[PDB]
Request: fold
Amino acid sequence: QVAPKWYQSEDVPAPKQTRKTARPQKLRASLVPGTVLILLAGRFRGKRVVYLKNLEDNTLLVSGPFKVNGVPLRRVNARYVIATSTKVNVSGVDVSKFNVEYFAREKEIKAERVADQKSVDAALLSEIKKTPLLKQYLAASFSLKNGDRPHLLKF
Amino acid sequence: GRDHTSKQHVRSGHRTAPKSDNVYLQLLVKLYSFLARRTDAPFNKVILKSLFLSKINRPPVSVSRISRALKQKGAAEKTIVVVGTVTDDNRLLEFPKATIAALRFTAGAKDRILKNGGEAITLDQLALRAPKGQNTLIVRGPRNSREAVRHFGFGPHKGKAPRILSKGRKFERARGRRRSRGFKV
Amino acid sequence: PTRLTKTRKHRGNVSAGKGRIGKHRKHPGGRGKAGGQHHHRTNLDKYHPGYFGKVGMRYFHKQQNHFWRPEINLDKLWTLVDSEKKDEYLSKSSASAAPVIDTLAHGYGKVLGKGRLPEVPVIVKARFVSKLAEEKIRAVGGVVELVA
RNA sequence: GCGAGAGACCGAUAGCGAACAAGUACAGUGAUGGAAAGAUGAAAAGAACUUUGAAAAGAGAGUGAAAAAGUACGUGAAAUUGUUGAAAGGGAAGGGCUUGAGAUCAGACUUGGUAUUUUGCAUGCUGCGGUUUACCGGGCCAG
RNA sequence: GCCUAGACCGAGGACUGCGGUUUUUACCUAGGAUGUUGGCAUAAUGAUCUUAAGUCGCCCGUCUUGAAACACGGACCAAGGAGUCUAACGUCUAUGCGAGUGUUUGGGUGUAAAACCCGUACGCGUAAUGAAAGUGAACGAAGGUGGGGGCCCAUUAGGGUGCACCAUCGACCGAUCCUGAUGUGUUCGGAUGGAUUUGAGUAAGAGCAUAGCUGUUGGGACCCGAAAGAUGGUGAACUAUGCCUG
RNA sequence: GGCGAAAGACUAAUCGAACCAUCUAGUAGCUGGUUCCUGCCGAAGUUUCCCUCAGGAUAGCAGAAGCUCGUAUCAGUUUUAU
RNA sequence: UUGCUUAAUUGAACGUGGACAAUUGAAUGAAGAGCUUUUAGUGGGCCAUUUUUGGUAAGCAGAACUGGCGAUGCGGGAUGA
RNA sequence: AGCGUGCUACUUAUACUUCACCGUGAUUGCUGUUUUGACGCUUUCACGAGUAGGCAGGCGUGGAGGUCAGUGACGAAGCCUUUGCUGUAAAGCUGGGUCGAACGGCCUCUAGUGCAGAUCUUGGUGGUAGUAGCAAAUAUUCAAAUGAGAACUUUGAAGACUGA
Reply:
C-alpha cells in the first residue's frame, strides 16, 4: 500500500474573505398591511387571512382573525401567499409589540399570546364589520374550481 | 472544432533534465537551476543546458584547445569552462598557467595543468568564484570529428564514407567507384 | 531484459506491429544478398558503390608480416622518450649529448613528419623515415640513424 | 557406460515417450508405431453392531481433528444439470442511457465539547465507557 | 436610461490587486456564496444489483475500396498456445577510463563454477593513398572572408574576442597528367613549378570497453501448413503372373 | 522395381511410382492465427528499377531522439511591378 | 589585388575606408526558426463536384485539380462508406 | 398535410458561447522560510477524432538479490458470493462461506510472463434427444419347476423349420 508522506499536511486553511454583504429584502407592491391574503401552503392552505406587519425575518405577520377563521397570529412566507386586492384598514391595530423573538421557540398555549390574539381580533373585527360580506368572505376557504385559470384571474 | 495551423501537443524536443541518474550530476543541475532562475546572467542558462547534453554532444576538449583559446587577445586570464572531460595532448610543446573548470579531468590533463602552476576546479567551485560567470570563456569540443558522422548522408556524389566492415582492394572499389568498371558515383 | 522489449507492449494487438496488409512473411525479397543485381540493385548502387567486379592483381600467399610498418609522427616522437627524463633532456640537450630515440624497440617502422618538434637535438633510430620527417629532424640539429 | 556434486531449470496437458507393473497396455504381416495413469488420513483407526432390502445399497451408529476426508478419497473451478427461492416472458434473447419499484450497502450528533447522577476496575478519590432533559456547536436534506 | 419575470452554476479558500464612496488607515456590489429558518439523523440522501417502461443498439474476428452479410472461422468450458536465443553489425542512450582502451586465452588466489589479483601479447584506435612498386599530412598565430552563443569594455546602441557549427576561398599528404635542376652503373634520379582531375585524407586527436531499447543479416527464426526430393530398409497372408504338388 | 490376354491395371481398404524411419521443424513472394490498460502523435496505396504485375529495393508520407539558436527570416495568401 | 581582360590607367571579381537606423524601404499571419540521425507501416485503393479520353451506355475502363471515404463517430437525407 | 413563393415564431448536433472536472503541451514563480519531497510544489493559457504504425507511463504472472526481526494451524494459498471500497482502466484491497500449509508488500533482477478465435491442441460437457432407430434369414404357444423377480433358464406337451 501507498504510505502517507510527511508532506501531506492535515491543517484546515481559513476561508477567504467573503464580499457577500446582505442587503434588505424587497417585497412585492401588492403586499401592503391590511391586504387580505390567501395561504397556499402549510396547515392553513386555502384560508383567507389579514396581513398586519412585515417582520424582520423576511416574513409577514398575519392574523385570521382567529374568531373568524381559526387562524392565529403567526408568520408566513411572502412566496407562499397570494396577495389579493381586497384591503382592510389596519391603522387602528397595534402590531408594534410583535417581533421575531415573539415567535421564538420556547399542547398548552401561552396566555400572553392568547391575550394578544384577542386584543388584535377586537380592532380587526370592528374594522371588518364596516365592509359588507367581508366577514363571510374571510371565513370561507379558497379553492380552484373547474375552469379557473390563475394566469387569467385577478386576485 | 479548430483548424489547426500546427501540430498539437508537441514537445519542445530539447532535453529538460539529464538522462543520467548520477546523483552528483543532479546536484550541479540543482545548483545551476537556481542560478539560471535567480541571477539573469546569460552564462548561467548556457551552463544549465550543457549539463543536460548526452555524451556525444559533450565531446572531449583537449588541453590544446584551451591553449588556443587562452591565446586569444585579452583572454590569457579568463576562466576556462568546459562542460565535459578535459583530456591530455602530448603534441603540445608548452602549456600556460590558467584556471580551468571542468566536469572531469583525465589523469594526464589534470597533471599538466597543475605542473604548470594552473588550477583545475570543478563546476561547483566556479559558482563560488563566478556566480555570474564573470570573465569566463566556454570551450566546446569538435562534434563533427566523430567517426559516426563520416557515414551520415551517404549517397552519390556526396563524398561521405561507406558503411563497410573491411577495407581493401576487394571491398567496394570496382563498379560505381571506378570509371574503368562501368561508371563512377 | 524481455520485460522492456516492445513484444510485451504488442500483446493484445493483432499483428504484433507487422501490419495487416504486409503480413510479416518468411523471406520476401530472398535470403541474404539475393537479387543484388536484379531487384536490390537500387540499394547496392546507392549505398555500396563498387560492390561488383574485380580491381587490381591477386597476391598469392600474402604474408602480412612483410607489410608491418607502424607509423609514428614527429609530434608524438618525444613520447617515446622516458617520461621521467623528458624535462631534463629537453633542457640540457646539445649536439655533444642528445637523447637517443629507438623507434623500432617501441614497435614502429617508419617515422613520418607531421607536427613540429621541440627545438632540441635528437638522435632518431628508425627503419624508415619520410623525406620531410628527416628534414625537420636535421632542422632542430638532430640526425636520423637507419637501423635494421 | 560407471560414480558423484550442483542449478535464477520443469513441477504431473510441464519435465525424458515414461514421477505409476513404460518402451508397458495396445495397433500393424512386417519394418515400425506407441499411450493413459501421482496425492484419504498422523495412524486403516478402511465403518463393529441394529434395522429396511433378494442383493447392491440405504437409515441409524461407530472411527477420526475433520466423513464439508469413505478408497467413485486433499482442495474440488467452469461448461452442464437437479431441487428450492426470486423474477420476467404476444414470431428470439442479450446491451447502453434515464428514472421508477424491490433488495442490498453506506453514512456525523463526530473519538462532539459543557456541569450533572448512578452501574462498573485493581486500587489510596484518581484515567474513563453510563444516563436524561438543559446550553453551545456541528452533520445532512430542503425553504 | 429605468422598471421587471425566470432558469443554471458557486470553482477558489488568511492578506496582497484595480477601482469606487470617501462621511474613513474606513467601507463597498470592487482578483469566484453567503445569511437565515425548518426538518432528519431507527431516517431525508446516495450507490449498486434485479426488473419495468421510453429511446437507441445488426455478430464478433478477418482479408477487403467496401461485411450484419446469401464471404470465411467460431456448439460450449477449462488448461496449454505464437517476434525467442545466438554470431556479427548500424543508430541512439547510460557508465568507466581516455590517446589510449579492453583483468577473466592464461597465471596467482580463494570462504571454490563466485569474489579478489596479475601481465605479455593481441584487437580496435591514434594516417592516408595507390592495382602495385611505393610515397606519406604547418607559408602564416594551423590560414582568409561572412555569420556565430558566451565573455570583456560600453552607456540604447556600439566596439573587442569569438568555442561548436554553417557557407565559402585557399594551404598540406597520396593517386593521375604535365614540367624536367644539380647529377649519372647513360638510364637512372626527380629538385622545382603546375593541372576545369581524384581520395572513405591533414588542417591541436576521440576512441575503447560494458550494458540497454530499436533495426539488420544468417540461423527452425513469430506459430501452424504443401504438391515434392534423397538415404536406408519392410512387404506377393490381398492382388498380378509363372512353376511344383493336390 | 515387379507383374500385366494392356485398364496406367495390380503390387496388404495405399499406386500416373507402395509402405516404414530418417534427412526434416524441408521451402512457401501464398492462407489462417498472433495474448494487458491508458496517454500522445499518426499514414499509404504514389516515383524509379527488377523474368517485375498477389513480391521486393528506392524516394515520398509517419514516429522517436534530439541538436543549434530565440523572431532570425519564413508562408498551399493577397498587392504592386515585370 | 590579379598570371584574367582592355589600345589603355579599360574592365571583371573580391575588398579596404566613409554615409545612409527603426517606415531598413508593400499587405496579412507566424504554438518560433533552422538542422540531423534513425526506424515503422504503406507501395490492391475507391467516391463526389468540375475538366476530360474510349464506348450506345454502364454502379464500365482510363486521366486532371480539389475535397472526402478508407482511418470517422455525431445531427439531417426513413434506410445507405 | 400538393405545387410556386414570402414572412413570423418555434424544434434540436458530440458544432458554437459561459462555467466545472480530467489529461497533454506550453507557461509564471519558488533556497538569508529549503522547511525532512526541486524527478517537487505552484501561476496562467491553449488544446483533446483516429486504422496501419511509433513512442511514453502504468497494471498483472513464474523465479532471483535485499528489506518489512512482514502475514499464517487462534487458519496460509486456492475457490464461491447484489459485503463493499479504491483506480479512467489494466487491477488492488476487503466482509461472509469453504479449506488445511504455506504466503505476501516494497527496492531491484530475470523470463518458457497476460488468449476469444488459429477447420488451434488435450480433456470434459451440451442441444439435437428419450429422438433416429433396435424391421433380411416362415413361428411360436400352454404348463410345471427354479428363482426376490421368468416373453427370453430348465423340463414336458404341442406347433414348426433346416430337408442329406
